[PDB]
Design a protein around this ligand. Structure first.
Ligand SMILES: [Mg+2]
Ligand SMILES: [Mg+2]
Ligand SMILES: [Mg+2]
Ligand SMILES: [Mg+2]
Lengths: 474, 474, 474, 474
């Protein structure tokens, strides 16, 4: 039961819009919207969406495995060894948000301050004192982008695993000699950095030049979650505000995916005429190039929706019905919809490109979709005795001012973390929060396993979070 | 009773080192160290210090007023009008951490997300709807450094007031015509930006080329807080670890100030031989150029302590007794003291240059000194009924889902804020936290009105803060 | 009779290596090497070559026309109008080295100082006073690379014509409204800059992603000059020094082209065994990325010559027989061949990327191949009475200190220029030298219509140019 | 007899404006204007001037020696050794335009292609084979500005000598150990680069913060050439066009110097009323910041000529009588004088900042003043037998195809060069032209020992240079 299995199970349920049913339903963690800062829904005049992993949630592990297979196949085509073909995607290894260290070839899980929580070299999990040799302060400077790459998108899950597979393969393959910064194959030296760059290039190639999109669209039921409540929620939003799409994908792919997402024998509710996907949006913008979108953006272009090609020239005209935009900037949205930033709720899955940047650059209100949360929540609840023991142990140890029973803290930490996978929870390792967790709290005003959870609150709902006080104020 | 009056009153008290006396004393807010993240003092092996506004706290408002007067005098010397000479520093106007908007000539108090809390044009406090014309989303993008300047140091207090004085003067002086982005004086146009740049240049000039240092050192009792407990605390630190100085000031100024700070007829405790200031430090580094110090830094140089001039060439030798360093980098400290970042507690007042950068770039532990806290705390406690009313009002309004009694929320917000000054508390406007507050919580592991408060805790003390949980974990 | 017709006629002649025959032959302008700075051939220890338009000279106008057709087809595929398909390449319009002005959509021929010699908007040649409106000083700042693009390669000939075709088409097509900086098609505005960028992108696409290479290699006799004297010259060079190839092309294309260039039933001379092309080179380097090659370059890689793919990793080994390199830098050549810059004669056609950069960055000796010279020389000689009249007229006008017979100077200038084509000589407009001419003189130590002309001088030859004197020295 | 002695001798002569006298006078090399490209004076509508070393020629070696002494004194004040005080400026050592190599501490004289003509380490002239160790290709990449500094202004003459003095001193002083890249003094390492930077900083300091200007203006007769023909030439220019001043100096210094330059008991000619210097200029611009002036420049400001301070704000008004400008750009000149670039003759001594940049960035006509030419010409003529022998030797050697009598070429080269000084002629070493010579020819349309030489040609004069032909055109 993957996170997408949870989501698709919830998706198959029809909406009971009886108000008592709704209030009961959202009380359950799985159908809940979680709140980091208060948000009066009544003040939202525009609801904006990302597509991939927001409206179109790709099924797991099938989609990751396809991405993996095609990336491997690309590496082999450019000359990586044939043994790569015997790799197979393993959903139990990667957790999202890990940092690849290109100097030493390690996957690192870090807290918000760059402190090392976990360090794996290939599939070898490096214990504390062993990590000191390479990380003397058990710390990385994560903004060193020449050295560190943060794998924080769901598209990065296959490469997260593939990096580890590669390091493991080269390390254990007798043709190569392991060195601190890469591998020696006679008169060739493959640095972890060049290896990392080849992988990044292959993932990009698969998405943009290869067969990933083709293979996705020829079996959308296998690869894409579908939910008849989507048009219900979007039609409700359109009654109280304006609705827009701003996606990095191109028009042709967007059209295939969105058409599938709305392909039911009905419109918003059962019994109603089907309406085309485009009719749910006051503004549709493709090729958005987020996060550049939230600064200067790119020139505004118009899509010829018949050919799927761009019309030649910059589009200088007004918002009209049936127009599809390409490129532009977040100011295009504000200007054409007559909105200020705080009137906008933008809904997406990219913690950096969607949520952090829209908040910091423009003051948009933010809703972060976290697909894995559908399953992380089940683990959090099922294993809460483990976390509470860890809390009591931390309390007890601190009150003590028999301390070598803090190896008990290491053991419980490991057991808890393993319930989530080899790289633990998205949100923490034991009692320590990840960078990702901290970013979620700081930049996502609201978050949930799916944006569909908004359906269970009225549009006048006031989402509340407690005020923060400084220690000297408390 | 300024914040420095509080500090000097506490400074005049001799240290009672009876352990029961210490435990009683630190319980009081004023003598307390506040904790944002847990810190085991036992793990600190090096204590590092900034000088200005950390070890040498300048007396208020006298020091600000001297800075103001000399900056004004400099502007007049380069050709600003004679009327500037009738300005006089007013400590009740500026609060630290405001943003000068160089496009429209406004001082802005903002939250952590760039939302406007207060907007003043000269001495005119612009109410909510009036601010929308210039700030349609009541929001600034604070990283727009071409437009916005964050006045976050205590050295910036005089210029904070002076900017407002200038805008007020030009606005009301009939020789000039007020325009949206500056002032017209016939065939001359003075933009707020050029005006701001002249002020910045004059403040710098006063500190580096003018008479500020000279006038400071000729009356140190008037300008500098002095506390006989300083050598006691530093000698205690030296018993359990190493002690260092890393200051942006030059050797000659540092020597004058530090000599004064240690000028008592005794050493660490009453009755003990006086020792020179330098003897309290295992490493002394001047001309540090923080925050560049925490990245590449500059070449390491040696001071000829006899002349106060730099020796010619890069210093390539070891740490030795009596050597004084100039320039270098944070790695110089780590290397010469045999320390890792988390073994270091760095103590300073610059939220950006000392605390944020040392934490983010190197993983140092941080202690932020906040001089104004000595007085903010007195206001917070004296006026806590006002804040609690504001809390109950916010609760009551939210539970309501007679709402026009949220003008009561505006009124109480204003009354509370005015107790601190015209620009309110350093840490909040009503129930909304400032950018500065948020930075303190995120980057200062510990903070206090003075670093001297460390004297009241044993060096094995475990400072504790509660673990943070995400909303879905709570 | 195109310039390539001249070259192929000369190519069909077998080499008479009788020394009297050689001395007679090189006296003819067509078989001559021209000298800008003295060069003792005896001091050259390495002869280096570019491939495209140096060893492999593409036949004209067939190759340009193929490039044109495929570029047009690409533009139409991305949505340019169908009328583009009725364009046909016209070799009489473009001259190499023109500057496209992206602001106003003009092709400009300029002197070395940026003074306008010719200005065409589409096919409208703009006379002197008319050009002043857009060019008030009849001058461009050619290093303004955001605005001006210098079309100085032979690959740029088709786009040179296509830019003019496009400007002419849009101007005369009633669907569009001509504006100063581009064209209006209702709510779309196509700037000359965006148009230029689409053309540049399409040319690149055709070369790298499209069918140009495929179509070239399937009819090499149609598209590529071939000369049995090539291996004779290269084998002679190998007797007195080392020989290398440094090309921006990839291995697979290089191999197809070079194999064709050496495909005769003999080796160096008639009657000798054929040898593979690779055997003529002490070092072969592909994917050179000139001109970046002459600074930092890129990492050195090794080609798997069996697959045509790169081996994985950086190549760290020595020069060995049969190895093919990829990437690297000019230092790779120097190091592996044991050469200093002045020991190297580098032979290429790219005035910037080959000749200027190798000279300026490394001090290499330079031989510029200028394919069009084979025909320009015929015009220069056939029409020399016109140029001499122009000289006498310039003399006579200056001595005069009836001046309106300087329209005679304009007329003769026009008649002379038209003998070369609509954009005149590569090297001048009337008595004014082009930028290209000036670059040739300043950076090409030697130049010729073909590098094959070296065959006619012994390898001890001292090429001589007169010393330059300043005016006060003369 | 220094170059300034020549200039002052010519300056003391009154102008005989009889037209036959003028034609006779300009025929002499010393009073001649030399021509690199033809220039019809009749088309010049604006004559523009630099001040320092153009209008105000500083006397040699007195001015250089003052600059030297004060720079030395500054270095000693910041802690260089006392032995520096025994240095004394020696005019026979430096030639202008040398390159300081900061890696190895050498002064280099180079040709236009970066080939080494002369290499001195301190006062040790390094012969050919010895230079190969550090310069394997006897070549530098002169645009490597991190490594190489081109000393091409007359203000750079003292530092040129001082660099050599320093290298010589440290090398021969037993307290220091000479290393490849600098000097070791125990635990201090002084790199040639840091040494060079200290010298550069001291020269700047002397000019801007020190006593150089003060000492200059208190003895203007000792330090500044003065010529009563200056106002005659400028008044003549004003009859046929407009006249402007664009200087990097500030108003106060400009006023002192210009007042002195016009301090005669007469105006343009003897017997005429004296007029203030400002009356000779249609536009006066100070603080020009050339060469940034010829791109974006800086904001346009107005000088309060009473105080010598800038008025506050950007000057937005028109050109008016008595206004003095500060900052701005070359476009300010064009706009306010109603001129295009080719209508402007700009007259200055800075080959880069005045002449190259005005020509390349704006297409201005250029007149380069070369103060040393007044004496170089005397050497060129007095020693022309030496140069002619060198020419005949070069001819004879080349015709030979007894070659070890090219040591005769080295000997004559050395003897010729020594007549000019230890670093030879500004314009050549033997038969090889310097970088400076090449820049003069390429960017100075006209040049001369003094701009006063324009007085000897009528304003309708057509200055002629021969057309350039390519080798294949000749
Ligand atoms: Mg997405
Ligand atoms: Mg400080
Ligand atoms: Mg080529
Ligand atoms: Mg000058």
């Amino acid at each position: 039961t993957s996170w997408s299995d949870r989501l698709q199970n919830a998706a198959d349920m029809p909406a009971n819009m009886d108000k008592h049913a709704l209030k009961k339903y959202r009380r359950e963690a799985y159908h809940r919207v979680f709140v980091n800062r208060s948000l009066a829904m009544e003040k939202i005049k525009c609801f904006g969406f990302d597509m991939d992993y927001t409206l179109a949630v790709y099924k797991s592990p099938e989609y990751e495995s396809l991405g993996f297979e095609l990336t491997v196949e690309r590496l082999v085509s450019i000359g990586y060894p044939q043994e790569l073909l015997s790799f197979a995607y393993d959903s139990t290894f990667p957790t999202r948000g890990l940092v690849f260290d290109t100097l030493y070839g390690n996957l690192l899980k870090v807290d918000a301050y760059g402190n090392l929580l976990v360090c794996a070299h290939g599939f070898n999990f490096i214990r504390g004192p062993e990590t000191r040799e390479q990380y003397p302060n058990k710390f990385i400077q994560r903004d060193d982008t020449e050295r560190f790459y943060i794998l924080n998108t769901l598209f990065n899950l296959p490469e997260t695993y593939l990096l580890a597979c590669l390091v493991d393969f080269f390390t254990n393959c007798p043709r190569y000699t392991s060195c601190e910064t890469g591998f020696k194959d006679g008169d060739l030296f493959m640095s972890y950095r060049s290896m990392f760059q080849d992988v990044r290039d292959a993932v990009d190639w698969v998405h943009y030049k290869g067969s990933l999109k083709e293979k996705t669209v020829e079996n959308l039921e296998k690869y894409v979650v579908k939910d008849g409540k989507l048009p219900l929620l979007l039609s409700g939003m359109k009654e109280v505000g304006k609705v827009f799409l701003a996606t990095n994908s191109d028009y042709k792919y967007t059209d295939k995916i969105m058409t599938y997402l709305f392909d039911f024998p009905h419109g918003p509710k059962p019994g109603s005429s089907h309406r085309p996907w485009q009719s749910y949006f006051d503004l549709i913008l493709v090729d958005a190039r987020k996060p550049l979108f939230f600064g200067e953006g790119t020139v505004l272009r118009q899509v010829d929706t018949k050919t799927g090609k761009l019309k030649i020239g910059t589009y200088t005209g007004p918002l009209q019905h049936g127009i599809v935009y390409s490129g532009g900037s977040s100011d295009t949205i504000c200007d054409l919809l007559g909105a200020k930033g705080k009137d906008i709720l933008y809904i997406g899955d990219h913690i950096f490109g969607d949520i952090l940047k829209s908040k910091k650059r423009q003051g948009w209100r933010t809703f972060l979709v976290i697909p894995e949360l559908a399953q992380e929540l089940h683990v959090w609840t099922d294993k809460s005795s483990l976390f509470e023991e860890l809390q009591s142990l931390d309390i007890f140890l601190a009150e003590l001012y028999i301390s070598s029973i803090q190896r008990r803290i290491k053991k419980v930490t490991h057991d808890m973390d393993m319930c989530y996978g080899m790289m633990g929870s998205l949100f923490r390792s034991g009692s320590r929060q990840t960078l990702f967790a901290s970013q979620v709290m700081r930049y996502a005003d609201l978050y949930a396993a799916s944006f569909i959870n908004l359906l269970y609150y009225p549009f006048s709902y006031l989402f509340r979070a407690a005020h923060v006080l400084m220690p000297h104020e408390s």
